[PDB]
Symmetry: C3
Subunit: 131 residues, 3 copies
């Protein structure tokens, strides 16, 4: 009954108009001998913030070796927030390992040129089951 | 042997409602899966919702079965009329007893103070089947 | 295939500089005969708010009998929010029970002297698995 988990405590701050991996949030599904069945994947980024001056925020995605499975974002409700507060983010998706999945990873990308910040615990977890 | 249930949507008609109404498509047919007993850990995941309105807007979300609401929570903005209605990620986790007579699990929502409710991207309802300790 | 769950509907409002238990968010792992393997733990506080006058917020942690496993926080984006809105918070961590884990619990602590509020459903859940 495999449980996969990866966690980080920081990432270099980057601005990106397109998805880039969150370094370290990666599960090697091949190395675990999972070749079929289903994975419930949670991307948990409980304390991120975004800096910028046009309604800042961050998109996050669960991706496999076949690309993005699901994505979401937080954004602030001010164009230039008084302070860039911590905006807890969770994304949950279920994947078919049998289609060719060798890995699951977290990615992120900028909302409107925002710099993306993780400076504390963030995780990527997966529970293996069947249909 | 180890079922994982999942349903996802990408949008819903924008509605205002003072009481819980189903989020269309966020439904798990538990009877169809032959789960008649045991426990379900259910996650309602609405990562990118927003609410529109003029009195501290927000949205309540619930996990419901055929026996009604199991658990609920809400997000709300911190301004009466937000400069822009930002995306407020929302997750709700609840564990249900299937053997009470649960045939289905669903997500519902309702307006905070007359807010219009918006999903325009990925949202999911997931469940892992288990047993008691 | 055990699923552990605990839920609450309120807690006395408190301010604390350091982690204190969220009363009622506790899983007795030993009492369930879980002695080894892995636990995917979810702390779900979907409708908390914080009151204060210095960028309010709340830190939340998953803790065992061996201390804090993972933690995160939300904060408002204003020094004195017009209204202290509901800021849904989820935290996910995976623990090794065989190290000496007898219980899992949720804890919280103040951001900048904030009073911490739960007045509706909050849960702590865990799925048991293996490496
Ligand atoms: C509250 C906060 O955001 N603290 C930040 C601080 O943010 C300031 C800026 O946003 C600034 C303008 O661009 O506005 C405020 O500052 C004004 C004034 O401009 C400032 O010079 C003065 O001293 O204070 C006033 C109001 O009191 C904001 O304070 O920016 C600094 C960067 O220089 C830090 O990021 C600070 O972050 C906090 O740093 C602490 C260490 O001193 C500590 O680690 C806190 O945990 C950390 O706060 C957390 O991260 C923030 C980014 C934010 O999410 C906050 O809610 C978190 O709690
Ligand atoms: C930032 C935002 O909310 N974008 C919305 C936009 O809202 C605009 C209004 O809030 C507006 C009121 O004057 O303020 C800004 O716009 C002004 C100006 O009025 C506008 O004409 C000019 O070009 O820009 C200035 C300031 O930059 C706000 O931008 O309403 C529009 C039109 O109806 C959209 O909803 C827009 O939503 C965004 O739309 C994008 C494509 O047009 C894209 O799809 C973005 O994802 C989407 O933004 C997201 O959803 C928003 C509702 C909000 O949650 C935001 O944080 C998200 O990123
Ligand atoms: C919008 C709100 O916060 N209502 C809240 C009120 O807040 C006011 C604020 O609007 C403005 O007037 O400034 C004052 C002074 O600081 C207050 O901050 O405070 C009241 C008590 O002091 C209540 O707490 C009131 O809370 C609402 O209460 C009604 C019943 O009267 C309902 O139960 C609402 O659910 C509840 O609103 C909910 O909680 C509040 C704290 C906030 O999170 C809302 O977004 C949320 O919907
Ligand atoms: C930003 C936005 N407006 C309407 C839909 N979306 C959106 C949000 C997150 C992800 C996606 C799909 N990549 C679209
Ligand atoms: C908004 C609020 N104030 C006190 C309690 N609540 C609340 C919030 C979400 C759900 C419920 C219970 N249906 C109550
Ligand atoms: C608040 C903050 N600034 C930088 C890092 N952190 C932070 C946030 C949540 C948890 C922890 C680790 N205790 C640190
Ligand atoms: Na692809």
């Amino acid at each position: 009954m495999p449980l996969l988990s990866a966690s980080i405590v920081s990432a270099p701050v980057v601005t990106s108009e397109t998805y880039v991996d969150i370094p370290g949030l990666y599960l090697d599904v091949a190395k675990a001998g999972i070749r079929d069945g289903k994975l419930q994947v949670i991307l948990n980024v409980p304390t991120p913030y975004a800096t910028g001056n046009n309604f800042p925020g961050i998109y996050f995605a669960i991706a496999t070796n076949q690309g993005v499975v699901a994505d979401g974002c937080f954004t602030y409700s001010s164009k230039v927030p008084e302070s860039t507060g911590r905006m807890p983010f969770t994304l949950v998706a279920t994947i078919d390992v049998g289609s060719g999945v060798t890995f699951v990873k977290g990615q992120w990308k900028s909302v409107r040129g925002s710099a993306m910040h993780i400076d504390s615990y963030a995780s990527l977890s997966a529970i293996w089951g069947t249909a």
